[PDB]
Design a protein around this ligand. Structure first.
Ligand SMILES: CCCCCCCCCCCCCCCCCC(=O)OC[C@H](COP(=O)([O-])OCC[N+](C)(C)C)OC(=O)CCCCCCCCCCCCCCCCC
Ligand SMILES: CCCCCCCCCCCCCCCCCC(=O)OC[C@H](COP(=O)([O-])OCC[N+](C)(C)C)OC(=O)CCCCCCCCCCCCCCCCC
Ligand SMILES: CCCCCCCCCCCCCCCCCC(=O)OC[C@H](COP(=O)(O)OCCN)OC(=O)CCCCCCCCCCCCCCCCC
Lengths: 87, 70, 177, 459, 101, 128
């Protein structure tokens, strides 16, 4: 039970989920691509993205931390901090 | 692989107290149990009998177990 | 409401929080994936219909009636994540989160079982007690007169020193001890 | 009874001639030896009491109280030696001397055949406890606690002296063996009404009765640990022993003069348990629990049936042991965190697991888990009060529910939950504290195997 | 102004600092270990164990076993002769003079 | 429309249905800024006392001492006997005592009157 996590697996899974989004062209996004500026997404798109990542990883990100998750690298770092990986 | 240190409070003193308590209880518990077994097996309990005529018993001759009589 | 770094909640924050709560409760009412997808798109269309409204009083009234609408149609018990507050496994492992200052009371007989770990602990404590005065001196000159206005802490400006007030948020126990 | 009095007064040259570092060892050792010696009082007979002399006797009621006192003294010596660590040597010897003197007065109190000698010892017990509370207590209001305690006791007890002297002049003797055979009915009049009030109010104050209990959450709180142990464990039972001895002369006027205090003590235990539900102080919570249990003993003595008397003496012994252990545990928490607030130090089971086990056992015996002698006494009193009237079962059931509620509230607040973040001086439990807890627990659990030696003189 | 001259509150002494093998009895290790030995021996090995042994073998505490034996004897004697096992009156009515009314 | 949520003592009004939440006026913003400033200053004090490496003890909370002193040692200095206090004391102090006294006295009188006529079945009652 409870297999461990790494930054490589977290980044691969978060990029998988963001790649399955129809509003993002998969050949353009990267680990540090912004949402409002570099990808042209609304705030509701950011909210739906955050909810998708919550459903993917199975734990809830609070709103006061969800408003500041703006690129995939910050999502990776937030999940890594919340789940205490690379110990 | 991937063994992590588990932070726990100092369990040395509690185990030391429990070991001391067990040792100091058993130090007289074992000889008393052995002595009670040897009293029961070899000395044995008394047998109820009617008082002989003209004979008055001592006050400790009205009890069954040897330890109670003592 | 209750925020560490801000004194209030903006209008856009209220709208986003309402959107997330409404979508979660709609997922609770609509347990199947395709049905939830359809009704989520309908809710997204409803939210996008009034997106471009510049009247502040009209947007405020729309938000108020949307909150009333959500309260009329909420689930009696929505889906809570297992570790989320109100969940089934929320604060379950708090009995195993022993703080790190209990290692200083260990007997030397059981301290000899982990020599390298306790050496690393000693050098960590040496670093903390060396950096404390520098970090409190940094914090003293950065707070404006009259006390801090928010609860945000500054980082370490120069090289060599650690951020102020770092010990109890770096050495916090793991989620699964 | 001179074979126990003389070693007790010989403890005084033992503590006044010992070294600067060997006073605790010598006093604890020799008090434990005399406590072992105290078992010779169990030569009780089914018809006659064990009458030693003209002045001293010991039946089956005073014997458990004597054994409890002589066992409790080394526990107080072990408990009180950590907070007196930095004290002057002469003051340390004076503290041990007051404990020895209190034990001497207590063992002369339970064996007094004459009633006026019982009164003299029972009010000689006031001075060492008042001195202990008002000198070695830690707070500001220890002086006010001593004033309240002293004046409640003396205002209750001066009419008792007047009434006892009247009984001596009218009947011709205050010897308890004579008064068992020379007793007369007490008719219904105003004179006999005030006789009953004068003979009863001293022990109603000392027990305490609800409404006269205002000195208890002060004297039990501002005292040191040894003072709290001897106040909860023995000193509340002087009132019970007094009502058991003095009810013989007050018949048949008790059957209607006992109604107001029965209503005060039946409703009083509900009020004190409800007070226990909303207490911010641990020591005050234990004191109010003591008030509730002594109200139970008051009702049992006042209805005067055999089952009630057996339940009363068993409940007295059991509550003495349990309250002493609870006060010791609260004192250990106080030494760790230097505050008596119940909400301050939380979640101590993750830090102090065996102490948490001791807390659980003390809480379980507090709510009368069978087959502890707590439950035996409480059950017998419940049966006798049901025989008295049937709605007493409603009152007793409500009291039991609230008692379980506040005992588990104590345990859950102090031991369970998330620990306090900013408290980092939680040292591991010493061998001394664990030994004290086990010496409180093991006799209490062992007495369930042979509960017949604590069931009073009419077992 | 400045108040009266008084020492500050002393820091609490950790007994486990200078002596990690402390039982909490005394600051000197020898006195502490001897106090532990004294309490553990004379409390548990002497008082508790031999006290329980003494209570267990009490010589017929309060005559209960004798009462049972005598009740057996009396029940057998009364059952053999057809006598009632117990009467409603503890004392003989022949030796009691009721008040005249 | 929708049924209006009526608040009760044991069911408070939600923060999303409060009309005073959506207030944007500058007085409320100033009040919220002042409250945040007080909270941040107190948190700074606590964290300064909390992260000290040379501290081994209890970070004393004056609010908790204030709460316990108010709960315990202020009630009688701030008590004035008036109509309300005396009325509540007479209702809760001597009310239940009188009620239970009359209940128990009536029950025991009925039982003792039934016993003396031999109307109460006491056939196997020899334990009391
Ligand atoms: C802790 C606070 C509460 C304390 C309560 C203490 C008890 C309350 C009642 C005490 C009454 C006084 C002692 C009575 C002793 C009676 C002995 C006796 O022989 O009685 C029969 C005797 C009868 O007289 P006699 O025996 O001489 O006559 C022979 C008998 N006849 C009458 C038939 C001819 O009673 C008395 O002499 C009077 C008794 C009543 C006294 C009333 C005055 C005192 C009122 C109560 C004061 C209570 C304390 C107040 C202060 C509290 C603190 C500030
Ligand atoms: C006494 C008044 C003062 C009170 C405070 C006293 C403080 C000082 C203390 C001094 C020493 C202690 C004195 C009291 C001693 C009481 C004990 C005692 O002596 O008992 C005598 C009793 C006497 O029993 P008895 O009376 O039936 O024996 C018959 C009598 N003889 C021996 C003569 C034939 O001892 C026992 O009952 C021992 C029985 C055997 C041992 C126990 C076997 C069962 C154990 C449990 C098994 C598992 C059950 C399931 C568990 C499930 C999980 C929980
Ligand atoms: C405050 C703190 C909390 C409480 C602590 C304890 C306080 C109460 C302690 C004392 C209680 C009152 C005394 C006991 C009364 C028991 C019932 C009784 O006998 O009442 C007397 C009387 C009953 O009437 P009756 O039977 O006719 O009397 C003739 C007797 N020869 O009754 C009457 O006639 C009615 C009353 C008349 C006045 C009585 C005054 C003397 C008694 C109180 C002193």
């Amino acid at each position: 039970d409870a297999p461990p996590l790494t930054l490589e697996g977290i980044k691969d899974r978060v990029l998988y989920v963001l790649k399955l989004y129809d509003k993002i062209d998969p050949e353009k996004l990267s680990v540090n691509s912004h949402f409002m500026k570099d990808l042209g997404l609304d705030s509701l798109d950011q909210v739906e993205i955050i909810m998708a990542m919550e459903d993917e990883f199975g734990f809830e990100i609070p709103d006061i931390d969800a408003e500041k998750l703006m690129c995939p690298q910050e999502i990776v770092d937030y999940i890594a901090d919340k789940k205490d990986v690379y110990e | 692989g991937k063994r992590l240190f588990i932070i726990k409070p100092s369990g040395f003193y509690d185990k030391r107290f429990l070991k001391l308590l067990r040792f100091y209880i058993l130090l007289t518990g074992i000889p008393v149990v052995i002595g009670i077994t040897l009293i029961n097996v070899f000395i044995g309990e008394a047998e109820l009998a009617e008082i002989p005529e003209g004979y008055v018993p001592e006050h400790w001759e009205y009890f069954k177990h040897p330890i109670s009589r003592w | 409401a209750f925020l560490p770094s801000a004194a209030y909640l903006t209008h856009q924050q209220k709208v986003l929080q309402l959107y997330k709560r409404a979508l979660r409760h709609l997922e609770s009412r609509c347990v199947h994936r395709d049905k939830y997808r359809y009704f989520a798109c309908l809710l997204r269309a409803r939210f996008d219909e009034h997106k471009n409204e510049k009247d502040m009083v009209k947007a405020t009234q729309l938000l108020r009636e949307a909150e009333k609408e959500f309260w009329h149609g909420q689930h009696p018990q929505p889906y809570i994540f297992p570790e989320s507050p109100g969940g089934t496994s929320y604060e379950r492992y708090e009995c195993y989160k022993v703080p790190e200052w209990c290692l200083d009371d260990w007997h030397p007989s059981e301290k000899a079982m982990y020599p390298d770990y306790f050496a690393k602990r000693e050098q960590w404590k040496k670093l903390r007690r060396e950096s404390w005065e520098r970090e409190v001196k940094q914090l003293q000159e950065e707070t404006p007169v009259g006390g801090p206005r928010t609860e945000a802490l500054p980082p370490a400006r120069k090289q060599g020193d650690l951020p102020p007030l770092w010990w109890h948020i770096v050495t916090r126990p793991r989620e699964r001890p | 009874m001179l074979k126990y009095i003389i070693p007790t007064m010989m403890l005084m040259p033992l503590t006044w001639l010992s070294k600067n570092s060997m006073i605790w060892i010598n006093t604890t050792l020799h008090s434990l030896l005399i406590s072992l010696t105290s078992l010779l009082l169990l030569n009780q007979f089914g018809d006659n009491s064990l009458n030693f002399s003209l002045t001293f006797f010991s039946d089956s009621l005073s014997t458990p109280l004597l054994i409890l006192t002589m066992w409790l003294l080394p526990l107080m010596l072990m408990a009180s030696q950590h907070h007196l660590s930095k004290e002057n040597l002469a003051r340390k010897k004076l503290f041990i001397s007051m404990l020895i003197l209190l034990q001497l007065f207590l063992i002369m109190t339970f064996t007094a055949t004459e009633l006026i000698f019982f009164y003299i010892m029972f009010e000689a017990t006031l001075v060492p406890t008042l001195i202990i509370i008002t000198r070695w207590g830690n707070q500001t209001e220890r002086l006010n606690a001593g004033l309240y305690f002293l004046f409640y006791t003396l205002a209750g007890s001066l009419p008792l002296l007047v009434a006892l002297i009247y009984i001596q002049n009218t009947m011709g003797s205050l010897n308890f063996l004579i008064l068992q055979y020379w007793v007369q009915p007490m008719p219904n009049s105003w004179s006999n009404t005030f006789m009953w009030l004068a003979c009863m109010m001293a022990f109603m104050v000392k027990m305490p009765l609800y409404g006269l209990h205002l000195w208890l959450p002060k004297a039990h709180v501002e005292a040191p640990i040894a003072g709290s142990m001897v106040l909860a464990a023995i000193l509340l039972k002087l009132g019970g022993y007094g009502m058991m001895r003095i009810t013989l002369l007050l018949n048949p006027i008790t059957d209607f003069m006992a109604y107001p205090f029965i209503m005060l003590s039946l409703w009083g235990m509900i009020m004190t348990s409800s007070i226990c539900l909303r207490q911010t102080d641990l020591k005050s919570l234990i004191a109010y629990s003591s008030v509730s249990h002594m109200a139970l003993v008051i009702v049992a003595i006042l209805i005067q049936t055999p089952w009630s008397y057996m339940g009363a003496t068993a409940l007295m012994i059991a509550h003495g042991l349990t309250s002493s252990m609870l006060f010791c545990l609260a004192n250990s928490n106080y030494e760790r965190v230097h505050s008596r607030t119940m909400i301050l130090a939380r979640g101590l089971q993750t830090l102090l697991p065996l102490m948490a086990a001791w807390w659980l056992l003390a809480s379980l015996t507090n709510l009368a888990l069978p087959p502890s002698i707590n439950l035996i006494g409480e059950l017998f009193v419940v049966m006798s009060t049901f025989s008295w009237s049937n709605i007493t079962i409603i009152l007793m059931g409500l009291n039991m529910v609230i008692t379980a509620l506040y005992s588990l509230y104590m345990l859950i607040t102090t031991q369970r939950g998330k620990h306090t973040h900013h408290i980092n001086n939680i040292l591991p439990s010493f061998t001394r504290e664990n030994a004290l807890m086990s010496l409180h627990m093991l006799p209490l659990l062992l007495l369930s195997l042979n509960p017949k030696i604590i069931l009073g003189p009419l077992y | 102004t400045l108040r009266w001259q008084e020492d500050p509150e002393p820091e609490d002494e950790n007994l486990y600092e200078k002596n990690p093998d402390s039982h909490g009895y005394d600051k000197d290790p020898a006195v502490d270990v001897w106090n532990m030995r004294v309490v553990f021996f004379f409390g548990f090995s002497i008082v508790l164990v031999l006290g329980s042994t003494f209570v267990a073998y009490l010589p017929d505490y309060r005559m209960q076993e004798w009462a049972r034996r005598e009740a057996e004897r009396l029940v057998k004697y009364r059952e053999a002769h057809g006598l009632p096992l117990m009467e409603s009156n503890c004392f003989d009515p022949s030796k009691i003079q009721l008040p005249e009314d | 429309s929708f049924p209006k949520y009526e608040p009760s003592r044991l069911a408070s009004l939600p923060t999303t249905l409060d009309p005073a939440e959506y207030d944007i006026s500058s007085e409320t913003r100033k009040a919220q800024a002042e409250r945040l400033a007080i909270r941040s200053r107190l948190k700074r004090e606590y964290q300064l006392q909390y992260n000290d490496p040379s501290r081994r003890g209890v970070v004393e909370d004056p609010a908790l001492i204030r709460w316990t002193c108010a709960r315990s040692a202020n009630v009688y200095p701030n008590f004035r006997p008036n109509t309300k206090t005396s009325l509540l004391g007479a209702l809760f102090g001597i009310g239940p005592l009188i009620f239970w006294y009359y209940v128990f006295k009536t029950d025991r009188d009925r039982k003792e009157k039934l016993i003396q006529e031999g109307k109460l079945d006491r056939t196997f009652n020899i334990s009391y």
